[PDB]
Design a protein around this ligand. Structure first.
Ligand SMILES: Nc1nc2c(ncn2[C@@H]2O[C@H](COP(=O)(O)OP(=O)(O)OP(=O)(O)O)[C@@H](O)[C@H]2O)c(=O)[nH]1
Ligand SMILES: Nc1nc2c(ncn2[C@@H]2O[C@H](COP(=O)(O)OP(=O)(O)OP(=O)(O)O)[C@@H](O)[C@H]2O)c(=O)[nH]1
Ligand SMILES: COc1ccc(N(C)c2cc(=O)oc3ccccc23)cc1O
Ligand SMILES: [Ca+2]
Ligand SMILES: [Mg+2]
Ligand SMILES: [Mg+2]
Lengths: 421, 67, 440
């Protein structure tokens, strides 16, 4: 009964959104009709965090579905669990932003925004006690990126004492050719750094590389990538959704993971893609990060680790202690006890045991540096800029977004270089 | 001696009352200062977001005044 | 008279409260519905156990207790659990939003919304007392509510009850079962805020209790339930003097005279024996000398520190069960020629002794063996200051970089409250040093 309101915006947002609800409904024993046909009581104990209860034992996701392009929401509707989402919670526009951030943020998105807010408000006013909001979106397009970041800004104006949490999909030339995506990402980051409390960096580069290199998948579809996102999203929300020795909400996550308000971009990780020692080893390995950053190139500010399945807690405790000792240089020494472990009995689907990793690492600067290089390769030669000035954007707004992201990088560097003595 | 006895008990009452009094006022000053501080933190946040609404009005103006 | 009101604040306070009240019911023969067949005075009386239980006309024995949390899910389990009929619903108080591990929210943002209602309910209990002695307050140092709400309540209680005694049972944080990275901040903030408002505080180091469950009870990975069962035994030992009568019984208040030499030096070290499994207690009887000796084994302490490297300012032994003074005196004489027991030069060296005859009770399905005789030592040692030094150091590491400070500032606090709290802690550590220096 501490409620979360889920918002999915754009194609990516809506696709990863639908995957999330599929996997968590399956985990909570919820049908596509909305009925409980599970076996464990731990499934329903905190069900209200993500689901509304309408009578006849019907569980409806507290989810709002948004796009400037009407097609995508027919896919959700005529996918699995399309029958579960509230019909009034679908909000579609007409044109589609066509990969233009300025269109999603300032023009078309701005026109559709108030009708989304009406659905937010309706869901929010029925809440016993609102925790806040999770937005799924990409930063490369125009709706998820532009309209998503507008939505955040407007929601934050009406609910400034609530938590804003995102699952943001970072662009790679390895997945999409759309050349303008480094502009859309930089502009989005500029917003996210000012207006979210916590952001999960789902990096398409890392997902590609996991699929190609590790899983051996020769050509990665979005369906291959989203199998990674969904396993991760299932993992990171575990302590929100189940009772344990540690009961969590979005605010306690932020308080404990975010030592400085701008440094709220997390590297998620997953294992396996085993014995307890092996799982532990794997979750701290670069190959397992959902963000293309090497942890050994930075320092961990904070870490949260979730072990799932039936295993020895004593063993998990010793292995977690063990990995910190062996890797002591990669954890800042000025935040004592900065790695926290939780255990949940319910494994995810098809695995006996898993490990999900939430890292606030100064190595996330590699993600932002990559985006900043692709950004700067276009902006000094002014490429495709008319797409943005044509919507009424100033040129200084591009310069500002850029050096705010540059500041973020050097702030992540400052805390990396910092010592106790 | 009876005078001294009166003065001891009166001193006891006075110090006790002073403790209660100082505790009541310190708490009132802390709760007031806190309420003010929190209000100013939220007011600044809302002002920033207000500037974002004002800047977006300028962007939609700038687009139309291309014609 | 003399009634004690218990106040259980936040998750740790509430769960420890569950374990304590369940054990009290077992020790006094009070059933889950509140009925106590051996109590022949219906609807009232001034027996020893009435310090902790009031009585209804219907024969129900009701804890003189309030449970408060800023979130409902821990207290909901009391409402729906085994001992649900013991408490009037008005004794169990919950808000909707917790403090989110944040002292500022517990003390100010969320705490201020429920504080007048809490004092109303406490007032209702106090009005049913004929000679209220004081309050026992149970909370964690680390939680947002256990820190921030407790310090708000203690300040308000000083206002509304004057110098009426307030004692604490305070859960000191350990890495093994901690919940927040900001526990050092919350610990220092409450400690500073509460210091002038508390007469005596019994700290319980979660790591000491965790170690004891591991080493003495062969529990691989102790849970809160394991810890709390042990903590409740230690709490029961301390309050036994209030809840039972007997010729050799010595009132807790009389121990307190010896334990608190200066108002700020009010943190006794508790040590408890024996903690032993059923398997090991079988055919092995632990004598008075054996359990007394175990009191000077640092492994049996509730707070990790080393008294062999500090000075004593007081030593109290609280025995329960089959124990006579002759055996105590013999055990003490042996210990006094064999241990590192150095007192400061301004305090006498005699140990103060109480004996309650009712043997220790154990909760069904628990880990502790039922024994014939147990002891809780309360000492005032300069060594307890080690616990402060460790916590202050953790606070300093984060605070030098202002890590997480914006979460507190965002809720209305200022940097000057952190530095003021920390300075009070430096002065406390200094105080413990000064009391240990020889007189001129
Ligand atoms: N991992 C993952 N990435 C996706 C998926 N769908 C799209 N993307 C990425 O999202 C970015 C493009 O954003 P979209 O969500 O397609 O665009 P939109 O938000 O709908 O915006 P417009 O279509 O321009 O209005 C590209 O970088 C794609 O690689 C998906 O299902 N999974
Ligand atoms: N011994 C013991 N320690 C506990 C228990 N519950 C929590 N703790 C400890 O208390 C600290 C966290 O504080 P809690 O009491 O859980 O938090 P709270 O008072 O409910 O405050 P918030 O939840 O932040 O609002 C950590 O050091 C935990 O190990 C318990 O039942 N027993
Ligand atoms: C670095 O110290 C900490 C980090 C996080 C947390 N909390 C509250 C968690 C919140 C959550 O939603 O997921 C978790 C999964 C595993 C472990 C912790 C959390 C607590 C901490 O001390
Ligand atoms: Ca009676
Ligand atoms: Mg699209
Ligand atoms: Mg709590």
């Amino acid at each position: 009964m501490r409620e979360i309101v889920h918002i999915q915006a754009g194609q990516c947002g809506n696709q990863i959104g639908a995957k999330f609800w599929e996997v968590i409904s399956d985990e909570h024993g919820i049908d596509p009709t909305g009925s409980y046909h599970g076996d464990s009581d731990l499934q329903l104990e905190r069900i209200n965090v993500y689901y509304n209860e309408a009578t006849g034992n019907k569980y409806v996701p507290r989810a709002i579905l948004v796009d400037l392009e009407p097609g995508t929401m027919d896919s959700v509707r005529s996918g699995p669990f399309g029958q579960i989402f509230r019909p009034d919670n679908f909000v579609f526009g007409q044109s589609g932003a066509g990969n233009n951030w300025a269109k999603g943020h300032y023009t078309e998105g701005a026109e559709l925004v108030d009708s989304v807010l009406d659905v937010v408000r309706k869901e929010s006013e029925s809440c016993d006690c609102l925790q806040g909001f999770q937005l799924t979106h990409s930063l490369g397009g125009g709706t998820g990126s532009g309209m998503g970041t507008l939505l955040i800004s407007k929601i934050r104006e009406e609910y400034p004492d609530r938590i804003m949490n995102t699952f943001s999909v970072m662009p790679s030339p390895k997945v999409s050719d759309t050349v303008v995506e480094p502009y859309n990402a930089t502009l989005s980051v500029h917003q996210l750094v000012e207006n979210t409390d916590e952001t999960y960096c789902i990096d398409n580069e890392a997902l590609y590389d996991i699929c190609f290199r590790t899983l051996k998948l020769t050509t990665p579809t979005y369906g291959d990538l989203n199998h990674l996102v969904s396993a991760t999203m299932s993992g990171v929300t575990t302590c929100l959704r189940f009772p344990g020795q540690l009961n969590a909400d979005l605010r306690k996550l932020a308080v404990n993971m975010v030592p400085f308000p701008r440094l709220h971009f997390f590297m998620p990780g997953f294992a396996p893609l085993l014995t307890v020692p092996e799982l532990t080893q794997q979750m701290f390995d670069s190959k397992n990060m959902m963000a293309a950053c090497d942890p050994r190139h930075g320092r961990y500010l904070t870490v949260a680790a979730i072990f799932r399945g039936r295993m020895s807690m004593k063993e998990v405790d010793e292995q977690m202690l063990n990995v910190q000792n062996k890797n002591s240089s990669y954890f800042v020494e000025w935040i004592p006890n900065n790695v926290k472990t939780a255990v949940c009995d319910i494994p995810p689907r098809g695995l006996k045991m898993s490990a999900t990793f939430i890292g606030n690492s100064t190595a996330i600067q590699e993600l932002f540096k990559r985006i900043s290089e692709q950004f700067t390769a276009m902006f000094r030669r002014k490429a495709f800029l008319h797409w943005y000035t044509g919507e009424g954007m100033d040129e200084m707004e591009f310069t500002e977004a850029e050096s705010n992201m540059n500041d973020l990088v050097s702030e992540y560097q400052q805390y990396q270089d910092a010592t106790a003595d | 001696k009876r005078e001294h006895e009166r003065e001891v008990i009166q001193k006891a009452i006075e110090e006790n009352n002073n403790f209660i009094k100082m505790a009541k006022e310190k708490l009132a000053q802390k709760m007031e200062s806190n309420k003010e501080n929190r209000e100013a933190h939220l007011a600044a946040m809302l002002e920033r977001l207000q500037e974002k609404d004002k800047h977006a009005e300028e962007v939609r103006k700038n687009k139309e005044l291309k014609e | 008279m003399r009634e004690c009101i218990s106040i259980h604040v936040g998750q740790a306070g509430v769960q420890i409260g569950n374990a304590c009240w369940e054990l009290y019911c077992l020790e006094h023969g009070i059933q889950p519905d509140g009925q106590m067949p051996s109590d022949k005075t219906i609807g009232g009386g001034d027996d020893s156990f009435n310090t902790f239980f009031s009585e209804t006309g219907a024969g129900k024995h009701v804890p003189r207790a309030v449970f408060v949390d800023l979130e409902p899910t821990v207290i909901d389990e009391v409402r729906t659990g085994t001992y649900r009929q013991l408490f009037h619903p008005e004794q169990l108080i919950t808000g909707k939003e917790d403090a989110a591990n944040n002292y500022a929210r517990g003390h100010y943002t969320i705490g201020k919304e429920i504080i007048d209602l809490v004092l109303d309910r406490i007032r209702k209990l106090a009005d049913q007392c004929t000679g209220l002695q004081g309050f026992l307050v149970f909370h964690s140092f680390g939680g947002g509510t256990g820190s921030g709400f407790t310090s708000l309540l203690m300040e308000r209680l000083s206002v509304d009850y004057g110098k009426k005694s307030k004692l604490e049972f305070s859960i000191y944080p350990a890495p093994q079962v901690s919940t927040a990275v900001v526990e050092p901040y919350n610990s220092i903030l409450t400690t500073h805020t509460t210091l002038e408002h508390s007469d005596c505080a019994f700290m319980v180091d979660n790591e000491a209790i965790y170690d004891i469950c591991r080493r003495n009870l062969d529990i691989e990975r102790p849970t809160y339930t394991n810890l709390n069962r042990l903590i409740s035994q230690i709490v029961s030992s301390i309050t036994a003097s209030l809840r039972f009568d007997g010729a050799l019984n010595v009132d807790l208040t009389e121990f307190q005279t010896n334990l608190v030499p200066y108002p700020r030096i009010h943190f006794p070290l508790a040590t408890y024996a024996p903690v032993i499994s059923a398997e090991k207690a079988y055919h092995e009887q632990l004598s008075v000398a054996e359990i007394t000796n175990a009191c000077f084994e640092p492994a049996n302490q509730m707070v990790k520190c080393d008294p062999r490297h500090g000075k004593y300012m007081a030593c109290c032994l609280l025995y329960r069960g089959d124990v006579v003074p002759k055996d105590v005196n013999a055990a003490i004489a042996t210990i006094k020629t064999k241990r590192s027991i150095q007192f400061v030069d301004w305090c006498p060296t005699g140990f103060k002794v109480g004996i309650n005859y009712q043997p220790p009770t154990v909760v069904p399905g628990g880990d502790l063996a039922k024994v014939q005789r147990a002891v809780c030592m309360l000492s005032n040692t300069t060594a307890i200051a080690e616990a402060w030094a460790r916590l202050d150091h953790k606070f300093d590491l984060m605070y030098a970089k202002r890590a997480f400070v914006h979460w507190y500032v965002g809720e209305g606090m200022e940097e000057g409250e952190f530095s003021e709290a920390r300075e009070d802690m430096a002065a406390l550590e200094k105080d413990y040093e000064e009391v240990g220096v020889d007189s001129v």
